[PDB]
């Protein structure tokens, strides 16, 4: 769910969202890691975890419009960046 | 769909053909109507030299085009 900017979260959030007591949550996430469906690390001294990669999932015909949207203006950035270096150094070799 | 052929002698030959015909066929038609062996005939159309294996509409030849015959002479 969370945007890629964060994908970092505290014990309390999971503990409530899965309605399991906090002292269990460590083992839960360890299980998650061990079966190999999610990757990252745990930072117990402040009760936080970081989760850098997650199993792909199917998704619907409207969510992919988000993919096309992101990809389009990623694409334009490349052309923009090319114009600059192709121009300013024209005299070395155009 | 009429075609004019010019030989070295300047005789003009008239052909009723089709845009999807092939050069082999027209060379054979000439063989029938004048007696020249097919394989001695080379066809010239402006600068291009026509190749046997493909079709007139590939060269977009049009109606009443004038087209040259050249003879590749052989050693003896």
């Amino acid at each position: 769910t969370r945007p890629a900017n964060h994908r970092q979260l505290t014990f309390e959030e999971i503990a409530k969202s899965a309605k399991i007591t906090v002292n269990e949550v460590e083992l839960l996430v360890m299980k998650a890691l061990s079966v190999g469906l999610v990757k990252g690390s745990i930072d117990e001294v402040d009760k936080r975890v970081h989760m850098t990669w997650v199993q792909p999932r199917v998704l619907d015909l409207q969510q992919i419009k988000g993919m096309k949207d992101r990809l389009e203006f990623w694409c334009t950035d490349v052309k923009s960046m090319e114009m600059l270096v192709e121009h300013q150094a024209h005299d070395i070799l155009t | 769909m009429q075609i004019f052929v010019k030989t070295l002698t300047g005789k003009t030959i008239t052909l009723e053909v089709e845009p999807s015909d092939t050069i082999e066929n027209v060379k054979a038609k000439i063989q029938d109507k004048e007696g020249i062996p097919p394989d001695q005939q080379r066809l010239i159309f402006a600068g291009k030299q026509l190749e046997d294996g493909r079709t007139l509409s590939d060269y977009n030849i049009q109606r009443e085009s004038t087209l040259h015959l050249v003879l590749r002479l052989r050693g003896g």
Partner: protein, 287 residues
Amino acid sequence: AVDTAEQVYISSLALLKMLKHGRAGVPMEVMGLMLGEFVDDYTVRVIDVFAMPQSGTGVSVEAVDPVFQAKMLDMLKQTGRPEMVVGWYHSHPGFGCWLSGVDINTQQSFEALSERAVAVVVDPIQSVKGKVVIDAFRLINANMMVLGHEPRQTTSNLGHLNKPSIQALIHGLNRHYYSITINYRKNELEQKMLLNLHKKSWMEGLTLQDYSEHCKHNESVVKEMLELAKNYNKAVEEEDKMTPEQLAIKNVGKQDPKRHLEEHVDVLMTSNIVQCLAAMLDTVVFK
């Protein structure tokens, strides 16, 4: 009478095959047969060439199966190559380029069979990346030349652009035959290929060199600079103390630190510039 200007056009593929075949029979005069057509009185064009089964003894070679030739040729027609025979070629390693003795005899019968034949000779062992050594000849008339007749007609400068070498004069080129100029005429599509022939994939261009190891190289060259600076000071101090050329003449053993100092620049530069630029770009183009 033969015009001085007439060309031989060879078609780039034939040349590559002539080389890759000549540079294998390394010390022996391997030979082969050559296919093309007589466009005109000012032309001959060779379009392809192929080898044969043959055996020899260092001092000679010849081919052993006659059937193989007719069978191969008659096969090729089924795939669009109806052209026929116009000549032959054989390789001279290191000798130079000329026809000698037996090579005239096997040549001359071609001309009784087919006028306007051509014999080609290539040298694969002197050639080098810039230039290949090829020649093409045809026999002078069987004398009756006490008349002093010229072998050829001339109506152009076009045939007198080149200087015959001493070696062929030793073996008598203008005495028994004559040379004919080679020319190349590439078509559009092959030359489009020929430039791609070295392109390298986009995958590489954006890639960074390791930053470790790179730093190692930097420290290596910087510590190499010292000794050259130290030597340079003395080399500045001592000059003009003797006659001018006796600087160089006395500097054939020991190196002169100017050049070695200078050419360690163009290694700090170039390297550092391009690495910093490539990192600076790709920090933007990905996220």
